Amino acid sequence: WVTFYWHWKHLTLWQGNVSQFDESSTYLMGWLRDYLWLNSSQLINGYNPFGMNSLSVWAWTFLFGHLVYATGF
Amino acid sequence: VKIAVDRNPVETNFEKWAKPGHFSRALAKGPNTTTWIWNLHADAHDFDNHTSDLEEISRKVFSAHFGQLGIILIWLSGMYFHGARFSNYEGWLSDPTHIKPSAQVVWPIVGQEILNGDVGGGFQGIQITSGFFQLWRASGITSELQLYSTAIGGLVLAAACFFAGWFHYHKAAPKLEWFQNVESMLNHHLAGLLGLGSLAWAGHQIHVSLPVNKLLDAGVDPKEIPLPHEFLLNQSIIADLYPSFSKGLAPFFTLNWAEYSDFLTFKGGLNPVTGGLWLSDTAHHHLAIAVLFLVAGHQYRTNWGIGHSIKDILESHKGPFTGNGHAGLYEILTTSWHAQLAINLALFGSLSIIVAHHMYAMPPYPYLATDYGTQLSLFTHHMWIGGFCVVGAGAHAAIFMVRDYDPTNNYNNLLDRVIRHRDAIISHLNWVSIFLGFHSFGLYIHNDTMSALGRPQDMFSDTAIQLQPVFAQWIQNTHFTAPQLTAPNALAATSLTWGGDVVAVGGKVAMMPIALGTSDFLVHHIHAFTIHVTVLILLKGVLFARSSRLIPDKANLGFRFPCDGPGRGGTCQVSAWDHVFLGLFWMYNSLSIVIFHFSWKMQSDVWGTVTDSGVSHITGGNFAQSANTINGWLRDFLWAQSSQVIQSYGSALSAYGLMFLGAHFVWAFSLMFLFSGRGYWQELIESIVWAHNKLRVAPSIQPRALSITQGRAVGVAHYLLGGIATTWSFFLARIIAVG
Amino acid sequence: YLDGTLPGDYGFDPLGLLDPTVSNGQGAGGFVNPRWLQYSEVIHARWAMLGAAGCIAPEILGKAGVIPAETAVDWFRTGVIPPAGVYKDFWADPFTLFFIEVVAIQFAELKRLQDYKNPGSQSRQYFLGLEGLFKGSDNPAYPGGPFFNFANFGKTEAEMKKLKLNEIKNGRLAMLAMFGYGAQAVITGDGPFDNLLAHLADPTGANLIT
Amino acid sequence: ADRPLWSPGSEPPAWLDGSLAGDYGFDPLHLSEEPEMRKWMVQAELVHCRWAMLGVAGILFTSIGAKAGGNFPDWYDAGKELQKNSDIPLGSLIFTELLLFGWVETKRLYDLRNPGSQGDGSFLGITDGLKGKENGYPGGLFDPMGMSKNEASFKEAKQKEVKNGRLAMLAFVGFIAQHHATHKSPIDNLLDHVADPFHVTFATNGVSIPH
Amino acid sequence: MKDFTTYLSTAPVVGLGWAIFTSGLLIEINRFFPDPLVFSF
Ligand SMILES: CC1=C(C/C=C(\C)CCC[C@H](C)CCC[C@H](C)CCCC(C)C)C(=O)c2ccccc2C1=O
Ligand SMILES: C[As](C)(=O)[O-]
Ligand SMILES: C[As](C)(=O)[O-]
């Protein structure tokens, strides 16, 4: 929670739209939409039939983390 | 076979209600601990735990059956009355193509009225995905004035159903001689309840096929359509509509069935304009069902030396390997209700899932193929119900084996032979699950690795290296060439999912043939893997319930216990109850995978809108080169299709997003229970009780934490609740914004 | 196990629904038991007789020149099943007549049910001076009394049993006849007597098959 | 076997035989089974009767005045047009009503919990009066005429007010049912039925007419 | 009647009677008084 807060604060600050945070940090649908669903398009598109790029290894590791999480479960 | 009941077996009085837990003498003494309430709830229906009087148990079951059917009938009456009082059913009926079904209107209190989505028909409300308007249109309903009376009849029948339950429990409580009439129960369920009902419903569809097939599909307003009674009696009307009538009903007496071709017709398929099917096919099918189930209920000797009983048939079936088989299975069934219940639920959920598969690709209603939402809803609903029923059959098998079983009178060489190699099956299914996991799941890992390493020409693909099935394609080929080669009298194939002929109604394609490639191959292997693992869990729970390799004295510990002790390194989740616990999770996994496959296939390679030049689907065919990788399911399906559920606060679909987040919440909440124990919680309750006793406000009933079994039950309950609710919200908010 | 003492007993009960084995315990209970069943069949025979003639009396009596052809009408075209027909000019309309008959018939019935639940209980309470007429009898099917039996034939019990069996035979035959009127009025859609004239004129022509 | 019952032959309830006025053994929902609930329901029915009789009497008299020629509205929609041109505002009338009725209904209540509690002389020194003669039948001041100082006449005179009140409260349900159908006065429904019995019910909306 | 009144002290009573009273009261206060988010003063 602390890291989500810090990260999304500085993310709304770096886009020059701190008002985005000041307006969407009030409820949970914002945290789910404006932060999790939104700032991940390069994770999904790290590798695709069109062709991968430098962000492919990080996407595969992002999936590796979920695999380890599910093994923990 | 006769009737045997008793008069006033239990006097009707409100006393036994004042003492909760009377049925359990251990509970009736008093609630000295808060576990008393949870045991009251978890044992009220445990009829074989109240007492070993199987007569009283059968009476309790035969009464709870009416208790359930009363609720069923009140539910159907409530649906009909919602459709009657407040709904756009007339508006939908006058224009089914664009007007959407709505039968729930909220109250203006705190802004919830935004949920009253603008559906047209001069009325606003909540869109319903249950499928009642399309089901009612097939009955010639022209105005709202009929659903009121239909609901009245249903409610009267439900009242009479509760009356019959009370009557057969407190005034006409039967005896085990009547309950155990397997001959009568079959020949009256199979022949009467099924055959007579099917014949009645076929005769109904025969005399109601006038409005739907001809008038409703000719732009005739429902008010303009003559009422059904005006179609039934007047012979001139039914002579003008279908020339086969008014002949004199001659061909049916002398069995010269030649002139009856206008209402018992066999066509197959549907017109790309009519949207739905025809009622003549369903009428012929129901007459076939009626005749079949009516003749089948006449193959058992009951009284007049005609036929053969079940016991002789069971005795006259023996082989070289087994020898003396089927010795007491008749007693197996006639003794315990749990055996019959498990045997029923075994294939009951399977046939529910089969009904789902036969409904998604064969919509048996008018003006619903374009309704891309009702199909998904009903399909997923029936599949989850089937999964639960199968897991419940797995549970009740062990339940039977625990209480109502003894290999002395119910002895059978079949069952003991199954038991004597109860370990080779488990070991070989373990090996087969390992095979499938390394050979159905590892392929996705390989594909992700290849796509990430910068070698797209090496990844498994329908273009790089093909791995698609042919056996399913050969079945589709045998079905496609079936007309005129192996099915002469047939016109079309079994379904339009493999026969081209893209049928579209108002831009939206009502049906387009379904392809089967490497993606479907991989996903069906994943399905087989998950189903085999679930069956492994359930069967290893059922078998290792009477005895095992570790603890021989396992039957005395019962069916519902968490463990035996931390000895021999640790014993946890050893009871069949815990195996059902894990089988619920595995059934969740398997059914979820299957429903996601269904949704994404239907949205990628089936559904869409047809333009002047071909059909433009919802998605740009993203199913081909995304299913071959685990990231694809997050690349174009989960990430892409989740925009509406999180973007629906501005419309009447915000409740879907609310349920979405709440289901996530309850899921993690279940994780809480699943990962914790009782020691920590019991000591925390200890300190809280300390805090209480300082002000003298603690309760007289000893507040204890939940039982280990109840802890796991709450865990699995919240877990499946959150999971199913999140997936429901997703599949129900995504499919409304694309249809 | 059908001793034959019952008036209209002939040993016909393949279903054996009358046996004393069913309804083992004693109490109010259900309806499948001899006390209810024989009484119910006598009630059905009584109604069926009272209706079998009432379904064919106006039509036969209209073919003759005694009753006006206006009132003579088919039994199913008099107002019951108003879709088929409704006699337009009575002194009142069908719903008013139906409320009348509801009140009267349920007096008649509920005062009959109470006596079956409580034998003879209807003479106890003062009922506008008609109590001595409602005293009942040992067999509830056969109450008898001053009004109900204003003259007496069955003074001797042998003659009485003969009367009972004659009445029961006529009643069950009239029950067959009533069910004959119904299904026969469905196919032909014509009065029961006219079907007899149409048949006797050309028996094979107006038989059961074609 | 000692009194007429409602259902001839049925067994009367064991908690009421002949002590209550208008007793016929009619209680299928086991109400007023305990002594306290019966002491409550007796006086509840009594007050229902004493209001229903006055209501029906006023309604019938105003209706007869209207039909004869008097300037009298019908029983329905009479509080609407008598308030439009009245000097006493609504609300100021309602709370005056409630203020006058609370003080008397409270004294009526606490004479049920402990009879004779009101005859201690605290209210204007009234001692002999304001003492509950029985459950729901006070006296002394409410009975100026010595018409209850004889049990032989009183047990017979009180057993008929309950019947008149039951009939009056059945008539009041007739007033409501007989308005939603015809929208006419109760006396008008009578003259339109004696002059011609053919204008009986089941003719306007009593039964559904889809055919 | 007596056993019924005794039965009416369990979950099917206050816990139903309660929380029905409370849901009704809150809904009525939010209906007559449409949208409060701050006190009068
Ligand atoms: C929290 C927790 C508990 C404690 C569970 C508790 C305390 C459940 C109690 C909550 C209920 C809902 C209390 C509600 C009862 C109220 C006092 C009265 C009801 C309110 C009325 C209005 C109906 C376990 O027992 C447990 C067991 C095994 C693994 C994990 C856990 C675990 O995590
Ligand atoms: C019925 As007789 C006694 O007159 O024969
Ligand atoms: C109604 As017909 C006489 O034509 O069977």
What does the model show?
The structure is cut from a larger assembly and holds chains A (73 residues), B (739 residues), C (210 residues), D (211 residues) and E (41 residues). With 739 residues, chain B is mainly α. Chain B is 55% helix and 4% strand. In chain B, strands 2-4-3 form a three-stranded antiparallel β-sheet, with no helix packed on it. In chain B, strands 1-5 form a two-stranded antiparallel ribbon. A two-stranded antiparallel ribbon of chain B has the order 6-7. In chain B, helix 18 runs antiparallel to helix 23, helix 22 (518-543) runs antiparallel to helix 23 (576-606) and helix 23 (576-606) packs parallel to helix 28 (708-734). Chain C is built from five helices and no strands. Chain C has helices spanning 34-63, 94-117, 121-124, 157-187, 192-201. Chain C is mainly α and 210 residues long. Helix content of chain C is 47%, strand content 0%. With 211 residues, chain D is mainly alpha-helical. Chain D has five helices and no strands. In chain D, helix 1 crosses helix 4 (151-180). Chain E has helices at residues 2-7, 17-32. The termini of chain E are far apart. The relative contact order of chain E is 0.09. The chains are: A mainly alpha (73), B mainly alpha (739), C mainly alpha (210), D mainly alpha (211), E mainly alpha (41). Chain B binds chain C through residues 2-9, 167, 171-172, 229, 233, 248, 250, 253, and chain C through 16-17, 19, 21-30, 32, 83, 209-210. Bound molecules: phylloquinone and cacodylate ion (2 copies). One cacodylate ion (CAC) binds next to loops of chain C.
Question: What is the secondary structure topology, with strand pairs?
Answer:
This is part of a larger assembly, with chains A (73 residues), B (739 residues), C (210 residues), D (211 residues) and E (41 residues).
Chain B lengths: L4 E2 L8 H4 L6 H4 L6 H9 L3 H4 L3 H32 L3 H6 L7 E3 L12 E2 L5 E4 L5 H5 L7 H26 L2 E2 L1 H4 L2 H26 L1 H7 L12 H5 L2 H7 L37 H18 L13 H6 L13 H7 L1 H24 L11 H31 L10 H8 L3 H29 L18 H10 L22 E3 L2 E4 L6 H26 L32 H31 L1 E3 L4 E3 L12 H12 L1 H5 L6 H22 L3 H15 L14 H27 L5
Antiparallel strand pairs in B: 1-5, 2-4, 3-4, 6-7, 8-9
Helix pairs in contact in B: 5-8, 10-14, 17-18, 18-22, 18-23, 20-22, 22-23, 23-28, 26-28
Chain C lengths: L33 H30 L30 H24 L3 H4 L32 H31 L4 H10 L9
Chain E lengths: L1 H6 L9 H16 L9
One cacodylate ion binds next to loops of chain C.
